Amino acid sequence: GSHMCDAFVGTWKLVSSENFDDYMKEVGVGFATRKVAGMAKPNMIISVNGDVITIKSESTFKNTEISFILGQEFDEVTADDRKVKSTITLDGGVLVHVQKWDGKSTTIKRKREDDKLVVECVMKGVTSTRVYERA
Ligand SMILES: COc1cnccc1-c1c(-c2ccccc2)n(CCC(=O)O)c2ccc(C3CC3)cc12
């Protein structure tokens, strides 16, 4: 039956992006990747089957898919080709995704706000906010 995470389930499309190029600079993304990545208007498809949550991104830049169980670390190859160790947890009603690689860490938090799914990507002191609405 229903879980709280079902608030995230569905098909979402990106409607606005603030400071993403600066976030990607902090992450260490190189120029050509930043330019083509920052142009993309991905769809994000989130589904839940038992204990497994799947988040897919479809765009003209890259399609990616992760499946995971909350609190259980997994390997992830990111859209910019970092190989990272990821763990995703739910804190209150916020999905918090921490990615670790090469001594560095970045946190992506996803939360519902009104009819939007707001994604906050933080690398040290730089925050990018990416807003999606239902497709
Ligand atoms: C341009 O962003 C994307 C384009 N196509 C597919 C996935 C993503 C992409 C995504 C993404 C998009 C939809 C669903 C799940 C994840 N994230 C997570 C943050 C975000 O929502 O933009 C990201 C965080 C950082 C980067 C930069 C490092 C390269 C790219 C992405």
Domains of the chain in start order, with CATH, are 1-135 (2.40.128.20)
- CB 119 near ligand 1, within 6 Å: yes
The span from the first CA to the last CA of the chain, in angstroms, equals 24
Report how far ligand 1's centroid is from the alpha carbon of 41 (Å).
9
**Among the listed residues 10, 16, 19, 79, the one whose alpha carbon sits nearest the alpha carbon of residue 47:** 10
- CB 79 near ligand 1, within 6 Å: yes
Longest Cα–Cα distance in the chain? 46
- CB 101 near ligand 1, within 6 Å: no
Q: Which residues contact 83 (CB under 8 A, 6 or more apart)?
A: 75, 76, 77, 101
**Among the listed residues 16, 30, 22, 29, the one whose alpha carbon sits nearest the alpha carbon of residue 125:** 22
SS3 content of the chain, % helix, strand, coil (to 5): 15, 55, 25
Distance in angstroms (rounded) separating the CA atoms of residues 43 and 56: 8
Ligand 1 atom showing the smallest separation from residue 59 Cα:
5
Distance in angstroms (rounded) separating the CA atoms of residues 44 and 10: 8
Distance in angstroms (rounded) separating the CA atoms of residues 15 and 133: 7
Q: How many CA atoms lie within 13 A of 116 on its CB side?
A: 11
Q: What is the resolution of this structure in A?
A: 1.7
Tokens standing for 74?
């997994």
Nearest-10 Cα torsion for 17, 21, 22, 25: 140
Bridge partners, 113 (sequence order): 116
Technique that determined the structure: X-ray
Task: Pinpoint the alpha helices (H) of the chain.
Answer: 20-27, 31-39
